[PDB]
């Protein structure tokens, strides 16, 4: 048993490019890329939460970590996508 993200990112590619094939090595690069991005974002958030003497990770410290890591227009588009996703998910009423 081993874990990969392959079906999800495959679906992401079929949403915008239906007639496009895939090399397995390309999944190896892109899986390493998404794991590396998750890696830096998560330890930046943990480092920031350890700074503020807090024991809890919420949306705001990863928001600040996204603002710290990503370039500015990617930062603003990423926080736009994240805020609309978390407000859609938070409307469970």
């Amino acid at each position: 048993r081993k874990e990969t993200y392959s079906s999800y990112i495959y679906k992401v590619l079929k949403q915008t490019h239906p007639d496009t094939g895939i090399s397995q090595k390309s999944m190896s690069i892109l899986n390493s890329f998404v794991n590396d991005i998750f890696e830096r974002i998560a330890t930046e958030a943990s480092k920031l939460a350890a700074y503020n003497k807090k024991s809890t990770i919420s949306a705001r410290e990863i928001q600040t970590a996204v603002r710290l890591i990503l370039p500015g227009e990617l930062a603003k588009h990423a926080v736009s996508e994240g805020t609309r996703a978390v407000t859609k998910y938070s409307s469970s009423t």
Partner: protein
């Protein structure tokens, strides 16, 4: 005129710290343009740390952590 705060004999003082016999006259404004991006690059990561701390003052504690995040960890003011 406030951007003219940094003075040319101070740039000469920084130049003779490097041990250079001859300085041409364009080096001063070149170093001005170099330094202006440079300090703003740590003001970028200082005031966001300050804002996430729910603070409206900066200190010696977040600026050293900004330099430690980018990669010139500095000793003397804690951290």
């Amino acid at each position: 005129d406030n951007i003219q705060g940094i003075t040319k004999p101070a740039i000469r003082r920084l130049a003779r710290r490097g041990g250079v016999k001859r300085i041409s006259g364009l080096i001063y404004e070149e170093t001005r343009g170099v330094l202006k991006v440079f300090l703003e690059n740590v003001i970028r990561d200082a005031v966001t740390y300050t804002e996430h701390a729910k603070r409206k003052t900066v200190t010696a504690m977040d600026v050293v952590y900004a330099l430690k995040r980018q990669g010139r960890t500095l000793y003397g003011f804690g951290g």
